[PDB]
Design a binder for this molecule. Structure first.
Ligand SMILES: [Ca+2]
Ligand SMILES: [Co+2]
Length: 237
């Protein structure tokens, strides 16, 4: 039932559902089967950073993922999000481990959306940024296994008290205020999203991955979404 638009950092390739044979980054429009992908040289144990940009004039959603001292990976897709998403939506982070595991730690997360109307004032906006997470992080909706406060970070998937990641885990963090992406009077709508992450695993085959996503305000973790479904989708269709 949920309506999901997402940018995915897919660390475990599942070639039987359309994934490339290599870890990658991709744009998902209402399906795990990414409309576009790009090769991603994931670095186990290092902090990477993901950037996601869109505007209603260009009508293309793009994402760039990079690690310090490393060439970045870029993926883009032509898409009018007004035709897939509702007027009011919630944005968030999601992550999953399945048969294989990894830590899905968010060290920082910022977001900006602006609606620009034909009138002279011309600006409606929502912006937030987390560089320090708290135990009772009231302005975030945590779903599934997601917790906050551990080393002031957001953990989207379950991690043991000794630091070891756990498998068969899924978790998301939604910003608690709804976001206004469409408006009748608007002449241009746009948004940016940024987040820093630490994926770490004792396995040479980490799984499953981390995604940013924009969805209906009542979205919840679909049941059985542990694994490559990344907490976003109920199936691989
Ligand atoms: Ca995958
Ligand atoms: Co994928």
């Amino acid at each position: 039932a949920d309506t999901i638009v997402a940018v995915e950092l897919d660390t475990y390739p599942n070639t039987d559902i359309g994934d490339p044979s290599y870890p990658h980054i991709g744009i998902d429009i209402k399906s795990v089967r990414s409309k576009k992908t790009a090769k991603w040289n994931m670095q186990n144990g290092k902090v990477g950073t993901a950037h996601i940009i869109y505007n209603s004039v260009g009508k293309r959603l793009s994402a760039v993922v990079s690690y310090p001292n490393g060439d970045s990976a870029t993926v883009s897709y032509d898409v009018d999000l007004d035709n897939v998403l509702p007027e009011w939506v919630r944005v968030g982070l999601s992550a999953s481990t399945g048969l294989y595991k990894e830590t899905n730690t968010i060290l920082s997360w910022s977001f900006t959306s602006k609606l620009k109307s034909n009138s002279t004032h011309e600006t409606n906006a929502l912006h937030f940024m987390f560089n320090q997470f708290s135990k009772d992080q009231k302005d975030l909706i945590l779903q599934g296994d997601a917790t906050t406060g551990t080393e002031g970070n957001l953990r989207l998937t379950r991690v043991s008290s000794n630091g070891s990641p756990q498998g068969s885990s899924v978790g998301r963090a939604l910003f608690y205020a709804p976001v206004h992406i469409w408006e009748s009077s608007a002449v241009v709508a746009s948004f940016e999203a940024t987040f820093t992450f630490l994926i770490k695993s004792p396995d040479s085959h980490p799984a499953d991955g981390i995604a940013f996503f924009i969805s209906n305000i009542d979205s919840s973790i679909p049941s059985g979404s542990t694994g490559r479904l990344l907490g976003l989708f109920p199936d691989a269709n």
